[PDB]
Amino acid sequence: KKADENKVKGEAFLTENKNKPGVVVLPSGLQYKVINSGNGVKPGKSDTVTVEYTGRLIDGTVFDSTEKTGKPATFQVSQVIPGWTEALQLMPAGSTWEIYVPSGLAYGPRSVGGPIGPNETLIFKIHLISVKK
Numbered sequence: 001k002k003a004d005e006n007k008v009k010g011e012a013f014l015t016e017n018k019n020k021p022g023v024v025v026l027p028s029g030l031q032y033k034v035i036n037s038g039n040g041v042k043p044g045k046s047d048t049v050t051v052e053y054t055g056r057l058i059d060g061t062v063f064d065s066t067e068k069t070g071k072p073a074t075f076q077v078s079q080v081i082p083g084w085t086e087a088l089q090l091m092p093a094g095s096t097w098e099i100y101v102p103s104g105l106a107y108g109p110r111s112v113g114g115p116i117g118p119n120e121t122l123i124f125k126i127h128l129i130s131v132k133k
């Protein structure tokens with residue numbers, strides 16, 4: 001049932017957010033807002049990125065962050081959630097975007113859960129610091 005509630009809440013959020021100013025909707029259902037535009041290279045699917053990021057739920061609860069850690073994170077572009085793989089490839093290095101990820105582009109129905117429940121819509125602030133081939 002938390003799965004059914006989460007699906008309805010996420011659908012409502014994405015339906016409302018698509019009308020909000022600055023929100024760009026992609027064919028995938030991934031949405032994004034440009035916070036700061038960078039002038040750097042865009043990563044490819046096989047590249048590694050160094051990023052600062054914060055992940056939060058629609059209620060505003062932060063579940064992950066590089067903030068006050070003293071260090072950025074490093075990820076292979078293709079080995080993160082589909083929402084990230086897609087968004088990173090559209091982001092010039094130096095850019096800060098806020099992405100709104102439907103559950104199908106994140107962890108999905110996910111019968112279990114913990115930080116991320118079933119049918120959970122995820123919001124991420126992503127600052128792409130650098131790209132490495």
Ligand SMILES: C[C@@H](c1ccccn1)N1C[C@H](CO)[C@H]2CCC[C@@H](C1=O)N2S(=O)(=O)c1cc(Cl)cc(Cl)c1
Pocket residue numbers: 055063064075079080081084115116122
């Ligand atoms: C590698 C991948 C991953 C590895 C293992 C298990 C689950 N997921 N992963 C996590 C990384 C942190 O390494 C982080 C940033 C990149 C996107 C995404 C992501 O794809 N998340 S996250 O914010 O959605 C997230 C999700 C969960 Cl379940 C828990 C946390 Cl603490 C944070």
